[PDB]
Each structure stands twice: as structure tokens, then as C-alpha cells.
Design a binder for these strands. Structure first.
Ligand SMILES: [Mn+2]
Ligand SMILES: [Mn+2]
Ligand SMILES: [Zn+2]
Ligand SMILES: [Zn+2]
Ligand SMILES: [Zn+2]
Ligand SMILES: [Zn+2]
Lengths: 162, 162
DNA sequence: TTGACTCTCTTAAGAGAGTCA
DNA sequence: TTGACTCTCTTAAGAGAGTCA
């Protein structure tokens, strides 16, 4: 098995490569009518992506390193968390984009949490709009708002009460 | 089926049958430290479910009627909305449980909205905790809260900024 | 050892359609 | 005509593993 030192070396090589990705400045809603700035380190749209990186899906990538003749591979956003527990409350931990930008690999924009917690950030009012996430959101979720409901609750007769 | 009269007849027969499902009272969080009461009309756990109803999945059912000698079938929660547009902004409209209770077929607990709007209600603070859904929530979403994040944003080196 | 592709899978909110009696 | 089963599919947040040079 890879030692702690070997895992730290994988995290360090990943950070060194991602740190050279193009850094894109994005202005974002924070909630409460305020605007903030996030700096995303974005993997390229097409090959080559960077040393160790390869695309396994339209918005999916993996990081690969060969150590003592053995090939090791990880989901490209999971590398910052290789020294962390990989499950919690019986649920698998997932890399969760606080910036809601899949191509971003900035580890300061990632957290490590259940898929439900991950998804829920899409609708969060944001750090200045009432976020209650213990690991605070960096921005209002892209899907926050009144929604676009086509039809609400209704009945034709009198068979039901709420 | 095709005619508005036929569609209204389907909705009316569906409402009559669902109106005879057992009414189960559920006390629910509203947000803001308040609690409310919902009356769900719950499809039975096992056959027979009611005239026109059949189970296609552990928590999935379909309603079927024979019109003009042809069988017409719908997802069991979609029937109240048969006169509504079936898409919005190019997204499929879905039956969305305001009570977060799949077996419930009370149309006063259903709305018709994109799958994203639908999902997002799981994390809503609720009608007394800050819900901004234009078609208002009936309860705080079951997944609202601080979450259980295992690890937050972090870097080992000095290559990244937020 | 490395790059650039290939494939299928998970989850939890939701769907459509066929086989028998 | 009605009932009671069977199967796979959609979406958008996420995954693992194979092939070839
Ligand atoms: Mn996410
Ligand atoms: Mn729902
Ligand atoms: Zn980012
Ligand atoms: Zn938040
Ligand atoms: Zn209900
Ligand atoms: Zn709401």
C-alpha cells in the first residue's frame, strides 16, 4: 500500500500541476444582494490537460501516477482528500465544488462530503444570504431562487384536504 | 386521451380513487422552529392498490384507463397535470411531492415543475424558515441543515487563492 | 511510465413500456 | 377490460476500470 509520504507526494505533484492551469476570475453572487470574486483553476477543454491528467467523460477526469511499477488512478477532484475518511454516516464521500465549476480543480474550491450534501449546495442562498452549511458555501447556489413551477397543487372536486 | 372531456374524465376518476386511499396525518417541520400538519392520501403498500393503479417500481406506480378500446397509461402522480404543458424552458415537467412522501397521491401535495426545482425542495428551509419558492413549500425539506462535511477546502503548498 | 482515448457505474428525485392471466 | 407483475430509462451532482502504443 502507498505510504503517507507517498500519498503526500501524489497530493504535492497534483497541486503543482493544477496550480499551472489557467486561472479564471469569476464574479459570483454571495447572497443578500452582494457580489464576490472566485479564482478557478480550470482544466483545459481538450488534450493535453496536464501531466498525469486524462478525460474519462465529458466533464470527468482522472489523475494517474505510477509508483514502484504499479499504476494508481484517482478521480481528478478526489486527490486533495486522499488522507481523509472516505465515508461518513454510511455514505460515500464525494468531491464537492463550492464554486459549481466542474473544470475547476482549485482545492480551495472543493470539499469532501456526501452526495446529498454536495447536491444541496446547488440551492443554497449563499454565505451572505443565510447559508447554514457548517463548511460554508463560497457562493449562492446557481439554482437558488423562486423556481419556474408550471402548475401548483390543485383539485377539480372536494375529495381532498391539505 | 385526446379530448379535453376525456382528460377531465381521467382526472376525475383518478381523484375519486385516490380520494379513498387511507388518509395518514404527518406532523412536519415548517422552518422557524414551527410545526404543521399534512394529510397524505397514501397508496397501499401491496396489491390491490385501487382501480386503475399498478406498481412498476418499489416506489413507482402507473394509472391506466381504456379509452376508445385503447389502453392509456401515465405515471401515477402525473394525472392532475394532464392539461398542463409537459415541458418548461426545454426541461421535462415532473410531478413534485411537496410532502416528500412518495406513496402520497394527494394532489394538494403535488406540483408540476422541472426536475431541478423538484430536487431543490429537499433542502428548502420551509414556509416559516425562508422558502422563496413561488409555489410555496408545505414543509422544510428533509435534507435542510448544516450537513456532515468530512473535510473542507485546503492546500498543502502556496499555489492557490480563493 | 505516460497520454488519450474507450467503456460502464452510483444516487435519489423522477419516467416509459412489455408480459401474462 | 382490469390487475399484477416484469424490465429499462432520465437527470445532474458524482465514480472505477480497460486498451494500446
Ligand atoms: Mn456539486
Ligand atoms: Mn421531490
Ligand atoms: Zn473554482
Ligand atoms: Zn451553503
Ligand atoms: Zn402528501
Ligand atoms: Zn421552498
Amino acid at each position: 500500500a502507498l505510504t503517507n509520504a507517498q500519498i503526500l507526494a501524489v497530493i504535492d505533484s497534483w497541486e503543482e500541476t493544477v496550480g499551472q492551469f489557467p486561472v479564471i476570475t469569476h464574479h459570483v453572487p454571495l447572497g443578500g444582494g452582494l457580489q464576490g470574486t472566485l479564482h478557478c483553476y480550470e482544466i483545459p477543454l481538450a488534450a493535453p490537460y496536464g501531466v498525469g491528467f486524462a478525460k474519462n467523460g465529458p466533464t470527468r477526469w482522472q489523475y494517474k501516477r505510477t509508483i514502484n511499477q504499479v499504476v494508481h488512478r484517482w478521480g481528478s477532484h478526489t486527490v486533495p482528500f486522499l488522507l481523509e475518511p472516505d465515508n461518513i454516516n454510511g455514505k460515500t464521500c464525494t468531491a464537492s465544488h463550492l464554486c459549481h465549476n466542474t473544470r475547476c480543480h482549485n482545492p480551495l474550491h472543493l470539499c469532501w462530503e456526501s452526495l446529498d450534501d454536495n447536491k444541496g449546495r446547488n440551492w443554497c442562498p449563499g454565505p451572505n444570504g443565510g447559508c447554514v452549511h457548517a463548511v460554508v458555501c463560497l457562493r449562492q447556489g446557481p439554482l437558488y431562487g423562486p423556481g419556474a413551477t408550471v402548475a401548483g397543487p390543485q383539485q377539480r372536486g372536494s375529495h381532498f384536504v391539505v
